[PDB]
Design a protein around this ligand. Structure first.
Ligand SMILES: Nc1ncnc2c1ncn2[C@@H]1O[C@H](COP(=O)(O)OP(=O)(O)OP(=O)(O)O)[C@@H](O)[C@H]1O
Lengths: 300, 447, 351, 37
RNA sequence: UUUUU
RNA sequence: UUUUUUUUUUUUUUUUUUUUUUUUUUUUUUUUUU
RNA sequence: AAUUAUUAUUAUAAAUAUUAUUUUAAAAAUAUAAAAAUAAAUUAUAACAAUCUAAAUAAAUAAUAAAUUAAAAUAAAAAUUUUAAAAAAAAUUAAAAAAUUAAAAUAGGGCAAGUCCUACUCUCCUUUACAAAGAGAACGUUUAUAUGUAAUUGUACUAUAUUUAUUGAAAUAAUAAAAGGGUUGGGUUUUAAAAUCGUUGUAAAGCAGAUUUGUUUAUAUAUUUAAUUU
RNA sequence: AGUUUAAUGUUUAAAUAUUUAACUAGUGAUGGCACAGUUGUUCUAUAUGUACCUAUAAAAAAUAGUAAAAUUAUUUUAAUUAAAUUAAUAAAUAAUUAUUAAACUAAUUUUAUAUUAAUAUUAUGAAAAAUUUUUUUUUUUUUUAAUUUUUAUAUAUUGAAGUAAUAUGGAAUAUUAAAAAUACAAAUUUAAUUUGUAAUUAAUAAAUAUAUUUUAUUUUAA
């Protein structure tokens, strides 16, 4: 029974505060295709004053018009924002944390202590892989905890479960900007009817099951893109009469790599092999490089 | 233990637990209560209640208490009460060199206190007591035998009494009472085996039947019940009325609190002492500032090493061990006692049953025994006074402090028949035991 | 305990010391001595202190003789029996130191499946809570309780707090003396003692097994997970159930039977929402977001909150037996909301 | 465990099976208040 | 050193 | 010894925080106990 | 390969020799092997068929304290019970099943020490050494010297102290041996080729003209529905 | 048709057999020669070195100093049965059972009584509280022989309008006390309430209620 933290996030607030009461610079790993669904609910009232380094991953597939406003929004509030294609990997995102403190850090009173970094975000959007990439390499090349790297028991090699107490990853050394873990507080599974669509749309929570069939997100990625064009160019990419009238033809027109047991005279193709295609291809930013969220021009 | 001490002499025989709970009903004379209340004693403690009329009667007794439970009054008070009823009622003549009662005492600083606590009993009018210890030209200081002594109560270390006998200067002929103090250690090779060999010459005189029948009242007072103490009392003495209180004995006091410091390095045992000596104490008459404290050492080689290290670090430290001269040891005691010097680099001289004002015992080496620990610790908190004992245990004494730490949180008797000191006791746990290395395995691996 | 006997030694209190005079009381049983000197404590309040150790001891000699209620006194030792007077302190002294209209006093009598001189078993309606949450407002069982006082017993005491959305069978004890006995029947079983029925949507893994999850309640409502296979050992307790999928909708639902060996919070539903990730039908608190009712041919109008959680406390094996030697097993029949989906599926609802 | 309340069987059909466990000083040595066949 | 139950 | 001096270690004349548990409430509530 | 035994001992050469060892007239389990259904070769199939008697001859194996038993009920002993006691009435024989009897004081959690392990600053006897002395040192050798852990080791005035400074460490994750089920608590369970080889029950002793005076009952459900009739 | 796995086999056709199961494409290799146990090969598995890596062969002793297991002889001629315990300057004995020996007196029936020495023998394992059934393990054959009785019961009537009274097996008594039952009268707040009388209650005082021997140990005679 290996589930995760399960409960409304708006009750994980007064405990998140005392976690920020001691931290210095707040981080976050989001998805630029989902500027405010991958955010914790308090992002508004979370800190308002600690220097946030809010990062949007997979930005190369998120649209560029909505990228400007979301950039200058926090950039007006003061809290910074950085967008990355992730092809140039987190190694450059790490470089940001080397630069995005030297300019904004308050000078350390004691020459070598830390810059205690509070990280948040969904573990499946890039926050896990960002920790366990810097957490694994610290075991070999050593900065603190000062022991001979032998006491890690059998079958762990990593510990993001059952201890996660004072556990923290030293990302840098001379400006030792360390980073916390924040035991995963996001995607509560009590999500909204629609948020699970935009979440499974982006490849996040890639589970497509009885809880969320392909034909429920595929109906969503089709009806979101009612403007046929540069998306019908993916349809026209597979012999489609450009405009699809509705969900029946376009999904059935793309059954060239789909099908099941059908007669030699009347073929009864398979619309689920066409479902996953239309679903999973939009995940790759292949069909269109367009966001999902609405980007409130107002403050909210 | 109940399911024990049956297979052990001196016990399996009833223990007089008849509480009498007040001095009046113990029939102690109002000429002695006026002197007791004069001292400050109003209510009889647990050991006193039960063993004062067990010696007000002529029952040969084994007084056993915890620490600072009143044993010194317990045995001494009724013996003065008894001596007074000898010289007045029976009119048994004093004679010259023939004392009515002897008292024994292990250490020189213990002999003297047993004299002033008995000196304060001149309300027991005719009784005159003289104590004696080593001196210079001291054999020429039995002049106080040729001189006025006639001392009905003669408190002395056993060895000097024995020489006054074998050279025909003492004559236990009329020894009516024979008391022993801190007998746990005194009746053993630990001191000299000289408490014994003195019982017997007394034991062989009251069964001589050609001089008057002076049935000498033997009184043993011992905080510890050792295996040695049992047999040389259970097997030789006649009708030993025991006074053991098995539900408060072989345990450190309640209001006393213990502290265990784990020390990894030989030279680190020092800072932990000075850091402990930052409690800033100073009294009227009982560069750095320590409280009332005794520091107990493994050896007198070291008891002066640290002493000089303390002094040269700025404390008013004192020093008391055996190899000191006569003037220095007399002085260095009369400074610690009576206000001055506030801290006493002592060896196991100060462990053996001494009373004062001390309030904090540093075990500069937690001892390897349960007597050498109850005797040091038991000097801290006496008769309801609060008190702290700090233990600088090491890697080598870890076991004994693995268990002391565990027996205290439970308040258990420290292996209720203590050992390792008087009864050296290769039987760790007292019976025909050599504990096994248990099993029922029966697999017996093959290759 | 060794510290409990310490403060007992170091407490003056008023320590009502009670002599045992030569004539009237020497020889009497101690529970006569206390009960005719201290009329304030009920006799049962006097047995607790006399046996518990916060006792009225007796002191003759140098030790305290804690005693059983029948130990008789001694021949005038002026053997004092000390009794406690100001327990309140570090001691923490022991226990003992609207209106229900009709249509309720009747409503609470159709919810009775079994009654004898020692318990009462009811049939709780799915959705009525037990403890009050809107402190003046909600109609719960504890406010109803002075309705099952059949034969004028003293306000039955609730024994195991069924949850809000959980339907089913409850047990009240009809006697504060029986309630002490009926404790060992609930907490941390070794073998099952109760059956929970439910309709989880989505055929789980193998239709027999045991679930061991390690719950952790972070306030508010954190509700954590397996995190330690052994335990976090500090803030975690485990909840074990031996589930059996009795029958199963072919691949989209199942009718599961949980035998909850433990007593953890929503342990039925949180372990069901992660036996597969197939939660119970209408479980909007832990699962419940797959769809509104998880999108079936059931009553599907409001849905968003229509479908009530198909969970039913089905059977409890009481320890009271019956005229024939069998132990009694209440069999609270399913609510219509489960009788809906059982007959809509044609299963033989076993009452 | 602690073997209590022995039973001395005399014969059968003449001991009534309640008098077996009798000859033990207790509430037995009375008549079974509610027998079962 | 001091807040809280 | 040796017994003398006025003394002298005297010489001498051969629970939790911090800058009570539990019974599967939904904050505040119940009920049992210590 | 223990053999006249699961076998073309094949380095080579080869292509129309009928070229010279395999009992049994029955039935089940099993074992191999087998027509039909929820464009391919597959399924699973614990489904027909098909092969495997008996008797005759030949004969081994593990096992063996013996019983006077052994049906069946039922209480009594630090005990775990092999017996004994009351109360019963339990027949031969062959066959087939394995319910019981003939193969470890164990499995799982929670704790603590130990061996294993790594690591050296301080420990011991290493030898293999190196330098030093000695010879006008072309070298061969014999003494005096502290290096590496090389590498093995081990290290919790009569009194009233003394017999232990003398290698120091690491959840050393697994083993071992222990305990245990205000500090404190997770675990709940018992086996892997069985000639049956003692009881057991199941069937049977092959034609009886003929059930059933009395033994003994694996015999087993009483209702979830649909559609009527007042 | 050469390559890391699964069933059958279960003294089996084999002291590892048949089928199941996980990848590499011989211009670089089937043995030439070569290595060997306080150690070879080593693609580093403390895997393999001729059907038990404790390798095999030979010779030997410290090797149950170890709940180890055995230890060969009927008809006899002395007893006990859990007791002991002090590390360490001048204090009468450890205790057990055993073998072999030794001595009767202030000390009563005209009773009774296993004391002493020498040597042999020291492991049969309690933790807590409370406290100052019983004699059996072991019999030469004939008789003889003193410890045996089962089960304890209780109902009906009338009036109540929901309680008592009468009858039975403790009974009715008597007074002091109360009747919280209750019934009656009288006074009234009608009525309920106030008031008293007696059923009745309790305390206490007095007089009342059933029978053996005989089956187990107390001796002879050979
Ligand atoms: N009856 C009494 N009541 C009160 N105080 C007492 C009484 N008797 C003695 N004391 C005080 O308590 C002190 C401790 O008791 P005491 O000096 O007798 O200890 P002790 O008997 O030498 O100790 P230990 O038992 O360890 O040998 C005494 O020195 C005296 O000050």
């Amino acid at each position: 029974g290996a589930a995760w933290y399960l409960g409304h996030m708006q009750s994980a607030a007064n405990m998140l505060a005392d976690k920020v009461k001691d931290a210095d610079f707040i981080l976050e790993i989001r998805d630029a295709r989902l500027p405010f669904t991958t955010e914790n609910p308090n992002i508004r009232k979370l800190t308002a004053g600690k220097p946030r380094l809010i990062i949007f991953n997979k930005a190369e597939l998120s649209n560029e018009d909505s990228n400007r406003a979301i950039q200058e929004y926090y950039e007006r509030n003061g809290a910074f924002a950085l967008f990355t294609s992730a092809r140039r990997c987190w190694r450059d995102v790490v470089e940001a944390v080397q630069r995005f403190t030297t300019h904004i850090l308050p000078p350390l009173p004691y020459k070598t202590v830390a810059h205690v970094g509070l990280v948040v975000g969904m573990p499946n959007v890039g926050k896990s892989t960002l920790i366990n990439s810097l957490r694994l390499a610290h075991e070999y090349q050593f900065h603190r905890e000062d022991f001979r790297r032998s006491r890690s028991p059998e079958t762990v090699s990593i510990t993001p479960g059952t201890t996660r107490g004072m556990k923290l990853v030293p990302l840098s050394k001379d400006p030792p900007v360390v980073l916390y873990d924040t035991p995963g507080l996001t995607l509560p599974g009590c999500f909204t009817k629609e948020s699970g669509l935009k979440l499974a749309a982006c490849g996040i929570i890639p589970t497509n099951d009885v809880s969320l069939p392909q034909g429920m997100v595929a109906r969503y990625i089709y009806d979101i893109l009612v403007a046929s064009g540069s998306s019908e160019h993916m349809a026209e990419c597979l012999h489609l009469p450009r405009v699809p009238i509705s969900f029946d033809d376009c999904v059935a027109m793309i059954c060239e790599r789909s099908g099941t047991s059908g007669q030699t005279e009347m073929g009864n193709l398979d619309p689920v092999r066409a479902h996953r295609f239309f679903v999973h291809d939009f995940i790759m930013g292949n069909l269109g490089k367009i966001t999902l969220d609405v980007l409130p021009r107002r403050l909210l | 233990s109940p399911a024990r001490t049956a297979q052990s002499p001196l016990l399996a025989k009833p223990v007089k637990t008849k509480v009498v709970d007040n001095f009046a009903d113990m029939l102690v004379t109002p000429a002695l209560q006026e002197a007791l209340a004069d001292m400050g004693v109003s209510t009889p403690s647990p050991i006193q209640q039960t063993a004062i009329e067990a010696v007000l009667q002529r029952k040969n007794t084994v007084i056993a208490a915890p620490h600072g439970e009143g044993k010194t009054l317990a045995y001494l008070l009724p013996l003065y009460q008894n001596m007074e009823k000898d010289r007045d009622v029976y009119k048994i003549p004093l004679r010259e060199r023939r004392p009515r009662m002897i008292l024994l005492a292990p250490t020189k600083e213990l002999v003297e206190q047993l004299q002033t606590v008995c000196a304060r009993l001149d309300a027991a009018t005719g009784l005159t007591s003289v104590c004696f210890t080593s001196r210079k030209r001291s054999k020429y200081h039995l002049s106080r035998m040729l001189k006025n002594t006639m001392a009905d109560v003669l408190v002395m270390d056993p060895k000097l009494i024995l020489r006054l006998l074998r050279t025909r200067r003492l004559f236990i002929e009329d020894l009516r009472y024979f008391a022993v103090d801190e007998a746990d250690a005194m009746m053993s090779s630990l001191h000299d085996h000289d408490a014994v060999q003195l019982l017997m010459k007394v034991q062989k005189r009251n069964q001589f039947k050609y001089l008057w029948p002076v049935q000498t009242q033997y009184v043993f007072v011992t905080a510890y019940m050792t295996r040695k103490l049992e047999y040389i009392v259970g097997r030789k003495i006649s009708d030993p009325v025991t006074c053991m209180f098995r539900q408060l004995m072989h345990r450190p006091q309640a209001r006393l609190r213990h502290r265990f410091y784990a020390i990894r390095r030989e030279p680190e045992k020092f800072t932990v002492l000075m850091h402990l000596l930052r409690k800033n104490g100073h009294v009227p008459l009982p560069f750095a500032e320590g409280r009332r404290t005794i520091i107990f050492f493994r050896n007198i080689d070291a008891t002066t090493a640290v002493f000089h290290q303390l002094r040269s670090a700025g404390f008013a430290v004192s020093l008391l061990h055996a190899s000191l001269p006569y003037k220095v040891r007399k002085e260095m005691y009369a400074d610690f006692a009576s206000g001055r010097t506030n801290i006493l680099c002592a060896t196991d001289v100060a462990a053996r049953g001494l009373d004062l004002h001390v309030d904090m015992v540093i075990n500069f080496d937690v001892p390897t025994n349960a007597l050498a620990y109850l005797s040091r610790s038991g000097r801290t908190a006496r008769m309801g006074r609060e008190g702290q004992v700090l233990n600088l245990y090491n890697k080598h004494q870890g076991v004994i402090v693995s268990a002391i730490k565990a027996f205290l949180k439970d308040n258990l008797p420290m292996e209720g028949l203590t050992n390792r000191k008087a009864d050296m006791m290769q039987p760790r746990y007292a019976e025909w035991r050599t504990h096994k290395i248990n099993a029922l395995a029966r697999s017996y691996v093959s290759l | 305990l060794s510290l409990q006997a310490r403060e007992e030694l170091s407490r003056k209190s008023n320590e009502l010391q009670y002599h045992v005079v030569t004539q009237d009381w020497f020889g009497q049983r101690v529970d006569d001595f206390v009960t005719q000197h201290h009329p304030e404590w009920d006799y049962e309040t006097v047995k607790r202190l006399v046996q518990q150790g916060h006792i009225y001891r007796y002191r003759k000699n140098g030790k305290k003789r804690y005693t059983r209620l029948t130990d008789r006194l001694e021949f005038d030792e002026l053997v004092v029996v000390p009794t406690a007077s100001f327990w309140e302190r570090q001691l923490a002294p022991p226990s003992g130191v609207f209106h229900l209209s009709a249509k309720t006093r009747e409503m609470a009598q159709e919810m009775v499946l079994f009654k004898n001189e020692h318990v009462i078993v009811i049939n709780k309606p799915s959705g009525v809570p037990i403890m009050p949450t809107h402190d003046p407002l909600a109609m719960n069982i504890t406010d109803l309780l002075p309705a099952w006082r059949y034969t004028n017993t003293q306000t039955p005491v609730i024994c195991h707090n069924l949850d809000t959305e959980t339907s089913g069978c409850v047990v009240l004890a009809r006697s504060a003396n029986t309630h002490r006995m009926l404790g060992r029947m609930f907490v941390k079983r070794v073998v099952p003692n109760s059956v929970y029925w439910g309709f989880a949507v989505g055929k789980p893994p193998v239709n027999f097994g045991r679930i061991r999850m390690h719950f952790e309640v972070q306030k508010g409502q954190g509700g954590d997970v397996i995190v330690a296979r052994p335990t976090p050992t500090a803030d975690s307790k485990v909840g074990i159930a031996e589930f059996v999928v009795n029958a199963s909708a072919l691949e989209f639902g199942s009718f599961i039977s949980f035998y909850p060996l433990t007593t953890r919070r929503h342990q039925e539903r949180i372990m069901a929402a992660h036996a597969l990730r197939a939660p119970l039908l209408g479980d909007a608190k832990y699962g419940g977001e797959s769809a509104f009712p998880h999108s079936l041919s059931l009553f599907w109008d409001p849905a968003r909150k229509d479908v009530p959680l198909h969970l039913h406390h089905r059977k409890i094996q009481l320890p009271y037996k019956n005229g024939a030697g069998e132990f009694v097993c209440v069999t609270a029949p399913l609510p219509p909301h489960m009788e809906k989906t059982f007959k809509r599926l044609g299963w033989p609802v076993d009452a | 465990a602690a073997a209590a309340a022995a039973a001395a069987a005399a014969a059968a059909a003449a001991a009534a099976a309640a008098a077996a466990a009798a000859a033990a000083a207790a509430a037995a040595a009375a008549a079974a208040a509610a027998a079962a066949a």
